[PDB]
Structure 1
Amino acid sequence: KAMINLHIQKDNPKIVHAFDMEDLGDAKAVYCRCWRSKKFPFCDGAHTKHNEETGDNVGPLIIKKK
């Protein structure tokens, strides 16, 4: 079975991010679930290239106010 993350922070044995929305000034955050973003843990659109290259259908998690 293949790894999901190829290159990101490989000296960390399990990559977890924790954020408190109280701390944010913005109304929206877009988080990467594909492990291909160059701005991980944030989405930079790299998922579209991944989906085309591999036939996948992954995309980000968005946290936002109405």
Structure 2
Amino acid sequence: SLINLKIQKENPKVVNEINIEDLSLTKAAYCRCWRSKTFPACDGSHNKHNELTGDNVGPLILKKK
């Protein structure tokens, strides 16, 4: 049932705040699988998780107007 295996395990609730107006990218993918090496950004690790596990998780994509 653990979702997060390794990230900031000394912190009892990992919460990331992002300033959506400071997007340096036209879109930006944010991780919902707790496997990204760029966490809280998405690096595509979700694909390795889904393949390993048979899961169907993917990122939240933030997009500029």
Aligned to 1:62: 61
- Give me the TM-score of the superposition, normalised by structure 2: 0.90
Count the aligned residue pairs. Answer: 65
User: Counterparts of 2:64 and 2:21 in 1: how far apart (Å)?
Assistant: 12
User: Counterparts of 1:26 and 1:55 in 2: how far apart (Å)?
Assistant: 31
**Is 1:4 aligned to residue 31 of structure 2?**
no
- Give me the TM-score of the superposition, normalised by structure 1: 0.89
Q: Displaced runs of 4+ in structure 1, greater than 6 A?
A: none
C-alpha deviations, 1:7-66, integer Å up to 9, x for none? Answer: 001111100011122223332211000001111000011000100111000000000125
User: For 1:10-25, what aligned pairs fall within 5 Å after superposition?
Assistant: 10-25=9-24
Aligned amino acid, residue 7 of structure 2: I
Whether the aligned pair in 1 keeps the contact of 2:23 and 2:64 (CA below 8 Å) is no
Runs of 5+ in structure 1 lacking a partner? none
Matched residues, percent identical?
69
RMSD over aligned CA atoms reads: 1.2
Aligned amino acid, residue 32 of structure 1: C
